Design an enzyme around this catalytic site. Structure first.
Site, PDB file in Angstrom:
ATOM      1  N   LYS A   1       0.935  -1.220   0.028  1.00 37.69           N
ATOM      2  CA  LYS A   1       0.076   0.053   0.080  1.00 37.69           C
ATOM      3  C   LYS A   1       0.840   1.413   0.080  1.00 37.69           C
ATOM      4  CE  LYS A   1      -3.929  -0.031   2.344  1.00 37.69           C
ATOM      5  NZ  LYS A   1      -4.984   0.038   3.147  1.00 37.69           N
TER       6      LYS A   1
HETATM    7  C1  LIG Z   1      -6.311   0.516   3.223  1.00 35.93           C
HETATM    8  C2  LIG Z   1      -6.512   0.970   1.845  1.00 35.93           C
HETATM    9  O1  LIG Z   1      -7.528   0.167   1.342  1.00 35.93           O
HETATM   10  C3  LIG Z   1      -7.355   0.612   4.365  1.00 35.93           C
HETATM   11  O2  LIG Z   1      -6.700  -0.020   5.508  1.00 35.93           O
HETATM   12  C4  LIG Z   1      -7.745   2.126   4.386  1.00 35.93           C
HETATM   13  O3  LIG Z   1      -6.796   2.772   5.213  1.00 35.93           O
HETATM   14  C5  LIG Z   1      -8.913   2.152   5.501  1.00 35.93           C
HETATM   15  O4  LIG Z   1      -9.941   1.429   4.724  1.00 35.93           O
HETATM   16  C6  LIG Z   1      -9.151   3.727   5.577  1.00 35.93           C
HETATM   17  O5  LIG Z   1     -10.461   3.552   6.724  1.00 35.93           O
HETATM   18  P1  LIG Z   1     -10.652   4.529   7.603  1.00 35.93           P
HETATM   19  O6  LIG Z   1     -11.166   5.994   6.963  1.00 35.93           O
HETATM   20  O7  LIG Z   1     -11.978   4.186   8.444  1.00 35.93           O
HETATM   21  O8  LIG Z   1      -9.482   4.742   8.213  1.00 35.93           O
END
Ligand SMILES: *[C@H](CO)[C@@H](O)[C@H](O)[C@H](O)COP(=O)(O)O
Ligand SMILES: *C(CO)[C@@H](O)[C@H](O)[C@H](O)COP(=O)(O)O
Ligand SMILES: *[C@@H](CO)[C@@H](O)[C@H](O)[C@H](O)COP(=O)(O)O
Ligand SMILES: *[C@@H](CO)[C@@H](O)[C@H](O)[C@H](O)COP(=O)(O)O
Ligand SMILES: *[C@H](CO)[C@@H](O)[C@H](O)[C@H](O)COP(=O)(O)O
Ligand SMILES: *[C@H](CO)[C@@H](O)[C@H](O)[C@H](O)COP(=O)(O)O
Ligand SMILES: *[C@H](CO)[C@@H](O)[C@H](O)[C@H](O)COP(=O)(O)O
Ligand SMILES: *[C@H](CO)[C@@H](O)[C@H](O)[C@H](O)COP(=O)(O)O
EC number: 2.2.1.2
Lengths: 223, 223, 223, 223, 223, 223, 223, 223
Positions: free
Chosen positions: G86
């Site tokens: 990521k």
């Molecule tokens: C990674 C990218 O898909 C995920 O872990 C995102 O950081 C989260 O889905 C972000 O969610 P929040 O807005 O609730 O931190």
């Protein structure tokens, strides 16, 4: 979309052809008889257009009966391989289109004013169908809506007849025909001439010229 | 879109076929009873229509029971390869259609008034389904809406049954059927005749003739 | 929505008025010529209709010129306070309408085929305007679309001219007129009769009767 | 929107009335004859409903002719000020509604299956019109679309007749009637009973009770 | 669209199968328990339906735990190649579906009430998913909305699970399912029988027969 | 919707005024310059139109500077209470409009090609604003789009300036203007004359007359 | 649509994986730092998730500079073939994604808040793009709107980057993502658990059990 | 969608190329003349851009006549395989485009302000057509509507000319171009830089950093 010139005026035709933007020509008895005056003969005008224009040239029969229509159609076709025989939407006209299509003579059904007339012409095998948008505008109906319905109908049945939008009076008939997806538009010379133009094109070019003079006083591009 | 003539009137049929714009014929027991008068026999009329029409000719069974329906169907089929057996939307009728489709006998399910009846007929294997738009108009429902729904349903399932719009009363039933995409319309003769016509076609022809006379007194096209 | 009967047939008129569902009558020279046969005089027929109908009765002038139109109009008006003078959409007709409106004579502009003709009639001061939906259907245009546009235009300008849908051929013209909001429909008698009917009304009545017999042999409601 | 109970079952009526959510009752000959068995008399059932129900109670005439309809209507009206006379959509029924409306007797036109029937009932002066949605569903048409058209038509002409949605079979007829803006729905008891309920209401209350026990073991609210 | 019968009543199943319009059967524990009375045993009922219906027959497991579900599923499958194992939308149920799909045992996930439940079932490998439209209608949500969403979701991901619309209560659930494009509807017997019927079909048939007797006294079609 | 004539040709104006359908006149310097030939002087032309037309007559200033515009405007206004001063959409023009509006001199802002120019004119106090639809069509934009936006903007702010659609080229500009709800259209004479006409009007009139002669040989209506 | 779990909590992950409904896992530095307390180490957590989950596991770099991001990405990738790296939407992030894509290391661009950021990530070759819907809801914009635009844009250009909807907060983000056609959703555990549940599923199961007891006091299905 | 940089500023080009998000460059005479100051020569600027940019670089001819445009175009083409010759929408320009296309020299038609000009450029064989959206915005028309129409036109006729949206002023021109499906956008440097940015991206990165420091004080990721 092909763009044809809707005139029998040979000067207009020569000009549009030299522009490189004319893909063919449509005529009708009124357009030809307008030019065939003061000694000029209609047969000569027709032959001259066929000679000048590389693409399709539509020429309308004048007979109202099947046999005369087919006879005139064969003469027209015999004038050159690019001639297309214009035949009106009538009972005899549909019969003539069927016969000519079986003889591999290209045809254009004219004086169409609604989508079911256009469908009947297609079912007779016609190469092009010409719905008249400006004459419908004349009587208080938006003629482009008929084009839109014809396009849908022809798409529904994978019809190979080309939609040739005729009786065009302004550049928005042309725009709307292209957005609908009509195969061909045929346009009077005035309209044709305006299609290339826009005031912001003129103004932009003028400012480019002015700005370029700053780095090239003679206005040229030396590379 | 195919255009059938909805009549058992021989003269109408001959004339329409002669116009070259008729792709088949539908009859029913009322249309035929209308013609079988003054010594004219229904059998002669049915055989004659089969003879003079090249396309499909629909002839309705009169039995209400499965066995009578299949017996009459096999006779109708035996009359010529273009015969299509018309069978009502009933329980016995669906069974008859399934049997006949297994025997490669073409069928047309009639007296259909909503889209799920049409779907059931298609599931029985029927060749054509005939929803009755005018009779729905008569009871205060726009019948064309049923045609639109049937076209969507049949598209969803890639159904091969042809939608044959029947009980047609006017040229807008025809126009809307073509925009929707129905496979066939069957029309009475007066409707058929009106489909070729438009006042601006007549007026445009008259004007072309008048203008052409200006440069050709004899009104001919000599090329 | 008002419902007028479109006929000059006295029996039809009497019967419809008797049903209590008829709010007026429209005639034209064809409808009347149809009734004025076998010694029946047009004048007697017109006077009789005026007499037996309580609501508006439209009677058409036959003159084509301004002065003849206003003379005949004043005679028609002189026949009874419920007489409405029907006047065609022509140049002479618009002038006649303006004059007659100044004289507080009620008028109905007829033979209207597009929305701007209807607007011109309204601007002349006409009491009713009558677009002909069935005759537009006949030439392959959905006539109801013209009614929708006229209703919008008249709403935009708070026009007081009533839209009177004419040339009605079926109960869906009537239904669509009511959904659009036309002020009046004029209908032939067969259409009028069909508007009260539905097969589920008949079937529901039959079933209520059969169920009631179970608890009341004489089939009556004794309270 | 008023909610009426569509039944002649006196127990169902007593229950719905005690719920406080029943604004009136509709009956018909089938509903009454269902209850009037094993010694029970229809006149007693009708009188008992009129006594129990504070709001409007619709009771249908059984006569098919004008005079009998009007006679029965007057008896019904004489049974109590909340009685409303149900009259079918027929020629005689419209005549009877007109007469009764002039006599200030409240009326309900029933067995309506399309919007133009509803419009005719309104033009006769009817207090309520009852289109039957479930019977239209039965024959493969979405009955709610008729409600939607009736609402538009009645809005167009500021019609004071109330739209009473009848032949209701489920809570979505009720929901859609309210979103459209129908004046009244009449519902069978099963349907009525389900309108107050939802599984998330039950679950939420259970969790509130459980959570409250934490701070008030006896479950009470002492303030 | 396939049409299954939703019942465990052998007589209804025999009747519908003999009509030729039933493509399969769904059952559930309530449906089977209703028939398994007065000596009839559920095992005989299940086997009898499997024998009578050539198409899929869905039979629900009763265990709530994975191991029991999988064991019952294997028994059900052992009864015939047309058996389909109905498994509720639960955590255990999804695990069972995944295991059974790997074993090439056909499955039907039931008790689905929103589109994401349907997607989870599809992702477990299920052959059919059954959203319950009537039970959503019961709690004041239009259940067909859920079918439309599931169709769109399944189309987006090219999902092969069939949408089997269940808890069907009327012929409009069926109509809407067909217009949406659901793969299967399962209908109770009363609904199924109503699908073939329409009052205009009966009326038209009666008129045709009457007219035919005019030319053929015995009512026969001799060819 | 008012209908003005867009011309400075006295014969066209006299003709249209005598038709009774012309509510006013717009002119511009090109239009006047076309008529002011062979001895005719622009001052006489302007005064003659002011005398013939009872409604507004719009006459354009020629000065490009505020002071000249305001002086010419006062002269124009001095010619008659029906004179309206046409002033171009320029910085000077807006200042002139503001001053003239304070002086209670009626104004028409011309050469407007987008909706924000029209809003600026309205904010200066102008009586009429004239967007030029044909000249937008000429450069490949549908000019009517601009009228629709201006209508919506003026409705949002309850603006009292009248929308006067100018540069009208066909009867569909007029139709669309009426459906949008523009206050005024100004039309050239050829367009105006075409608005009253339709082929079905002529055809219907001819048939009525023919039918009437059947009952009244002299073609008269004697009452 | 693939469904990933958005957490670093090993118990949640084990539970979801055991349910069989979890296709992959996403983490971020906040989620990991939350778990890596009381002596739990982030390296151990990352490795344990990689071990437990068959599918993609996204692990975010912490460096903000190109060289560190690429180095960290190579370490993450070296941990297991299911690791996805990521990388935030920043200039150096886009450079890092292009490099890693050329090294066949799968990537997920995160912290995307509008559709053109998503497009830039796709143009860099990223395997997944993660637009954040809930953080957009947090600032008063409907975050699902950007998912819809991204789906259209990616469809227009046949983009191979998967849309991974992140920052999901409730089951309607999930529903709407599936109806739009997003490739993947990543959901917190609470939301995940809620997706299988519905009160009518619970109710329906309870009633089936109760009815089955009538025919099998065992609660068993013996076949 | 390809993203080009619309500038002749070498520093901007170098920076954007180094970012890795720039797919090509467009220039025009104004942009080049801005940079050809303080002794810098246009030939050198042009060559430097061709050298730095791997993708297409559009360089405009300055001649207004066919012969000179074709001569200059061949020089430009001669500079490098990635040179694209920018030619204005004029009669001479369409002629030059046709010639150059026949010689397989890539072309870009510029100064396009409506969809029919774009269509004429496509029919001449041009490689790219550049409609100018910001200059249309400047004159009070939403320029993006022109891109939408061109996209529909090109889709109708399967046109291979790429739509290169030019005169871009803000990131919403970019977003709307991508949702419409334009092939290319060309953007000024300040717009290009704003595309990667969003405040929630910055805020999210800061929070991830802060949270990560809690478990790794040096801010490192050791794996
Ligand atoms: C990674 C990218 O898909 C995920 O872990 C995102 O950081 C989260 O889905 C972000 O969610 P929040 O807005 O609730 O931190
Ligand atoms: C070439 C055509 O793609 C481009 O350089 C255009 O000339 C500019 O995009 C025009 O933009 P401006 O309206 O800002 O000059
Ligand atoms: C057979 C089915 O296509 C046809 O002949 C139909 O019976 C008629 O089209 C029905 O028309 P009517 O409603 O006029 O009987
Ligand atoms: C008068 C105008 O309302 C009416 O009588 C009309 O002439 C007829 O309604 C026209 O109908 P047809 O098209 O059937 O003549
Ligand atoms: C042939 C058919 O394509 C054409 O020449 C048509 O006759 C004209 O286009 C009709 O135009 P007018 O309505 O201007 O005569
Ligand atoms: C009176 C009219 O409002 C009612 O009692 C109706 O007859 C019923 O609502 C009709 O319902 P069914 O279709 O179930 O008979
Ligand atoms: C199996 C799933 O397809 C079916 O038997 C369902 O249980 C029923 O269709 C449910 O219908 P009810 O809501 O009427 O029980
Ligand atoms: C005054 C403004 O209402 C009018 O005379 C306008 O100048 C014309 O309508 C402009 O029309 P053209 O574009 O045909 O000159």
């Amino acid at each position: 979309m092909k763009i044809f010139l809707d005139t029998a005026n040979i000067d207009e035709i020569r000009t549009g052809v030299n522009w490189g933007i004319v893909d063919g020509v449509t005529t009708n008895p009124t357009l030809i008889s307008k030019e065939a005056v003061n000694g000029k003969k209609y047969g000569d005008i027709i032959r001259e257009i066929l000679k000048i224009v590389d693409g399709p040239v539509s020429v309308e029969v004048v007979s109202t009966k099947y046999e005369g229509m087919v006879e005139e159609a064969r003469k027209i076709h015999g004038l050159g391989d690019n001639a297309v025989v214009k035949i009106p939407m009538t009972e005899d006209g549909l019969r003539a289109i069927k016969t000519l299509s079986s003889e591999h003579i290209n045809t254009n059904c004219t004086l169409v004013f609604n989508p079911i007339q256009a469908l009947l012409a297609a079912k007779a095998g016609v190469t092009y169908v010409s719905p008249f948008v400006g004459r419908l505008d004349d009587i208080g109906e938006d003629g482009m809506q008929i084009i839109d319905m014809i396009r849908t109908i022809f798409n529904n049945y994978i019809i190979k007849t080309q939609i040739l939008v005729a009786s065009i009076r302004n550049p928005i008939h042309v725009l709307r025909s292209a957005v609908i997806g009509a195969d061909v538009v045929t346009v009077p010379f005035n309209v044709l001439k305006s299609l290339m133009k826009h005031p912001k094109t003129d103004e932009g070019l003028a400012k480019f010229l002015e700005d370029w003079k700053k780095v090239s006083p003679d206005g040229k591009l030396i590379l």
